[PDB]
RNA sequence: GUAAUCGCA
């Protein structure tokens, strides 16, 4: 199977509300977009490299359009990196990106 | 003989240019019974909106394989002598006797 | 006024013989012959099909003997199976079998096929049984192109390889008639396709066109299967060794005035290595250049 | 003045929007002209999307790359970062013969990293933390030398999202219009701008008035106007209820004085052009080999826009001619089909249920022949 | 028909047996075979590297072909063997006369020189390019014979000149003008002009066209001093200063094609020498 | 420096031309000339 | 099945027979090419490689 | 300089006619060809005796001819041996028709 | 391997009017190389459009072949010099040009006034040589066509001498095949050699020919939106009146099938055939 | 290893 799992917006709100000890990676994807299908393979490889250190979840943009709209989702191949510390800022990456940059991001910030 | 062959070919080209493509190619489509003059083609285009290409395709759609094969004498790569194309069996039988 | 095509005639003379005729009426002078010859070469040799490639018999000593209860020898049965038309759209090897019993005639209907493969004629004569016998045979179905030479004659016992011809289109022909448009020498194109039932003539035409487009596409690619090939190439160039990363540095990155930049771009000078290899006399050689800009470019290169 | 000294014949086109890799602004359900019989006969082999949805386009970088591949001289204006990804994008643009002299590289800003704040309750995010160097471009950083040689200006709506970047792109557009260039505006409404038609119109109301040529999609045209889409959107037939040419009276309210030609493109299957004196629509092919990666139809719009820009820039005096516009539309459809074929061949098919293929970093892709296996 | 005078097609099943010791030595030298037995077994197994080594072995080795009716001294010659996939020894067409060979069932033998002196002798003396004259009267023995002669005759035959080209006398009343031979050949390739269609070709002051000693059929002299001299096959315009301004040859694409191919063969040989 | 022929070429004319080419340019150039002539002849036939 | 020396009946008996049978074939199966009135027994074929017709007609048969 | 003579010179160099030209040039400077053959044979024998392992895929006679051509001011590849840069891969050999 | 790639192995510039380039296509199956080569050659030689002069206007010259005061060469000579001028443009339709050199200057060259779209490739080309002080004023019309050699706007109505113009930019093209085979597999390699006149590079010519072939082979994929025992039954067996029987015999109608194929209007055409007869034959047929 | 006989070109 795949470590990344489809999650609704309500459980995403619950996860961002409650405290956590692992970085939260949220991927907005749509079945139609081609780039997002590739990004899923990078997410799977990253979840393999980080089995329990980080959590990778995905949400369908077509089913949840208002939630993506309020989160300032400007484009389909976007990734949201949420730091464990509730004081640090979130990181949004737009477009298809290398896996090394994602590793550097989740490591440094 | 080459001079007369070329003269007949040029006359056939002039007839094709004059009468039109549909009217010229109407000799090998016997299942098409409609006015093939340029005036009738223009009238049909004004009425329905089909140019000469559409009407010519519709005419060729009613052509038999047998007829198509005969029409091939009009190919631009290997034009056949129109006199030989329009000869009669009585004259052709006299070739060998 | 446009470019149109249509199917003049569609004739199913038999379940393994089809006929189709198409017309490309508004074609220009030199396009008709090229399109015709390309379509002819594509229909014949560039269209692939599926046929039986291997037959396994139960208890025959050799392929040049006779089995009791069958009017045909093993070689005749192989020749009959060689002419079995099949339809498939996926590559690879699949397995089939023939399980008939009792006196009668075994045909292509007795063949049990995978869900992907299908039979076209369904009534071809495989063999004739004149006695109550159990006829069991195995078949391997493969999809390829052209003709296949039965190279592994010496192979696993009990299986005989049959050469197969994967050409679905039997014959093709084209004729170019004039359009009589005066100065603009336009012509009319006709196409005749004879298939064997595996695919209709229109499908054969579309497949030939798509194959020609696929063959002509690579010329429009970049000069010599991952979306991050450019990043990997740049990383390797900058990491491996010097004088190779210098190639990855262009005049664009080197700050330069518009005049010198445009003059070097017109001079087919793009990377910094080309600028370094070129001499100062060659730089002065180009038009709309002066000795003043040479000092500027030399200084900003030393910087 | 270096105009007579070194300008050159192909006039320069300027791309201002953004440099991104495999980015999709938005997507709307659409219809396609395909042979349903050939699809149903080869349903197993061919990859056909269950619901067909296409994108208005890609990014300005892809447009510049396509226009350079078409032989035209393109220049990309923008700002990136000193990180490895920005340098890779710059190298990719340079290797495709695109002028990147107007590309600025700053280390203080990252290429694609947008720091944002969690915000108040309800998941309301905010980007006040730090931009991503794609919405950050100062007015003083605009390269006037490129705009002087440029006779055409191309930008997109994705830039106008940020208030600073909107002011920057408006300054660039007005500077180009004052230095004598025709503004090409490709409106590609991003995902947030599909909430309300009036808000989307007011947002793009600073645009649509300083441009001479505007390219819009059929869905975006229906959204901007009051027309509601009424189509099955999934039936296996072409019933002439899709690919419909809207009357010029519907186009008239959104027309303005400086506007010259308006293009409505429903993919590469049918492109409608609207002019003050004439209106017509040219059909095209859209039944092309499609992979899951290529299902988006992003390269088609980029090729169409590149062909249109190339054809218009070469003969600016014939922008309003009927025959020249028809030739331009045919060339754009051909370029879109070619680019779609090239992207389908370059990026193959995802591995099937049986995947035992050597993997590249974070990716694994096979060919059309490898994907068409029995199991 | 696509071999050169020095190259001959040789089947692989014959070459592997003729050069067997050489390919054994090759397998022993490279890290492909330990001993003679393993190398012989690999050669019998028809491994792909064996064919590569066989090709690399005979790139500079000469083959001596010969025929059973060795009447003259040209019965035995020497060629460069080229590996082919078949069982029939290919031979150059122009060299057939020497061997009195026709492809109706004739067979030939093959011989491999082992010694270095024999190899030098075969490569220098017994090659075809060194034997182009029969030792009887010293006449060219290798010449176009059956099909090449027909092609050359069709090229240089000519055109219908008199009543065949025109039905009525031109008194009551050729056309194409080409500056270069390349333009005329390109027009022929583009089917603009037929093979026998007449044309005019401008020449750069050479006058090398062989023709009859015939005076101009008509001469046009204008007031300003330029007089046009019309000949049978060429037009020579001159001026008052007795200066040859222009020369136009009236010919067909066949003659210019033959002349250009011979001249370009000579020039390509001269350029390749350097 | 070669002549330009506007007459029909036959077997005896070809033999004469080949002999003259062997005399002027030698056998080395004549080999390549003859190969090119053979190629053109086969093509036209 | 023809006995030898068919010219005992008339002159050019073989030629008459051959040309008559070709004409009939051409008429019945309407392939005009089989009998060309200009050059009986010869047809004009094309090249498989380039697709251009040959200049002179060639003999087409099934021996 | 003829414009369309690239492929001809390329084929002349690739085929091996350079060897024939060099042989003719070296025989144009010798009274008796038999003594020249014997001298070339002796020089090739010396070359083989000096370095046995060097040869086996490179011909000593071609090496002698290339040395004699290079010593005369004409550049020639060592032993007239060239490799195909367009080879697909190991084990793939061209088919010369 | 398994991905078709192209590379320019050789390229050179012998002069400003001659270019050479050689290309490669490594992975190719048997039979594809020859077809691709033939199609690419046909596209390069016929499907690439060029720009050249198609018309001239010589007000001073009263004849096609004459010597003007200070031109020093015949009008035919200057026309042959003009037809060799190479131009680079992306024109749609016709245009006008002009050369208005007025001086005793030795050479007239690169003095043609062209719109921005059209450009010259080689300036050193020699149009004419003025040996005396004179005003050389010639008008030129330039067109761009896909090898349409025959184009006459007015058929020499005014004092305009039509110039023969070849619209082929590619001077020559050729292809070769190298077949590399290891065991069962056989790979072919295509080598394309292109010679251009300097208006475009061989790589650009390759790209244009490929795009032209693709555009030629696309319309086939286009789709349009949507909104017998009668032989043996001769007419002799069926009881018919003698008159209509003889009419059908004269009209080459011997079997029922034939009659059935014939239509009522067509039947009426036969001589001596009344309309009532059409009724009689129809009634007898319906009786059967 | 020799004959006989036929074929080959
Ligand atoms: Mg014989
Ligand atoms: Zn007889």
Automatic annotation (TrEMBL), chain A:
Q: Which UniProt keywords apply?
A: Chloroplast, Disulfide bond, Electron transport, Oxidoreductase, Plastid, Redox-active center, Transit peptide, Transport
Q: What is its main location?
A: plastid
Protein's UniProt keywords contain Oxidoreductase: yes
Q: Which cysteines are joined by disulfide bonds?
A: 33-36
Q: Which residues form the Thioredoxin domain?
A: 1-109
- Extract one GO cellular component term from the record: chloroplast
Q: Which GO terms describe its biological process?
A: cell redox homeostasis; plastid organization
Location within or outside the cell: Plastid, Chloroplast
Q: Name one GO molecular function term.
A: disulfide oxidoreductase activity
Q: Where in this chain does the entry annotate a coiled-coil region? A: none
What task does this protein carry out? Answer: Probable thiol-disulfide oxidoreductase that may play a role in proper chloroplast development.
Family indicated by similarity: Belongs to the thioredoxin family. Plant CITRX-type subfamily.
- The identity of this protein, by name, is Thioredoxin-like protein CITRX1, chloroplastic
Q: Which organism is it from?
A: Nicotiana tabacum (Common tobacco)
Upper lineage: Eukaryota, Viridiplantae, Streptophyta, Embryophyta, Tracheophyta
Whole-protein coverage range:
69 to 177 of 178
Automatic annotation (TrEMBL), chain D:
Any idea which UniProt keywords this protein has?
A: Chloroplast, Kinase, Plastid, Transferase, Transit peptide
Residues shown, of full length: 268 to 642 of 648
One GO term under biological process is:
etioplast organization
* UniProt source species: Nicotiana tabacum
Q: Which GO terms describe its molecular function?
A: kinase activity
Protein name, as recorded: Fructokinase-like 2, chloroplastic
Q: Which GO terms describe its cellular component?
A: chloroplast nucleoid
Report the subcellular localization. Answer: Plastid, Chloroplast
Transit peptide as UniProt keyword: yes
* Domain Carbohydrate kinase PfkB, residue spans: 46-313
According to its UniProt record, which protein family does this protein belong to? Answer: Belongs to the carbohydrate kinase PfkB family.
What the protein does comes down to: Required for proper chloroplast development, most likely through regulating plastid-encoded polymerase (PEP) dependent chloroplast transcription. Acts as a component of the transcriptionally active plastid chromosome that is required for plastid gene expression.
Automatic annotation (TrEMBL), chain E:
- Membrane-spanning residues where? none
Ligand binding (Mg(2+)):
102, 104, 106
**Domain of life (superkingdom):** Eukaryota
UniProt similarity note: Belongs to the RNA polymerase beta' chain family. RpoC1 subfamily.
- What's its job? DNA-dependent RNA polymerase catalyzes the transcription of DNA into RNA using the four ribonucleoside triphosphates as substrates.
- Please identify the protein, giving its name as recorded: DNA-directed RNA polymerase subunit gamma
In its UniProt entry, the species of origin is given as Nicotiana tabacum (Common tobacco)
Task: Report which gene this protein is encoded by.
Answer: rpoC1
Automatic annotation (TrEMBL), chain H:
Q: A Gene Ontology CC term for this entry? A: plastid-encoded plastid RNA polymerase complex
State the superkingdom. Eukaryota
Q: Which GO terms describe its biological process?
A: plastid transcription
For this entry, the protein name equals: Protein PLASTID TRANSCRIPTIONALLY ACTIVE 7
- Which lineage do the record's taxonomy fields give for this organism? Eukaryota, Viridiplantae, Streptophyta, Embryophyta, Tracheophyta
Query: Which residues of the parent protein does this chain contain?
Result: 70 to 166 of 167
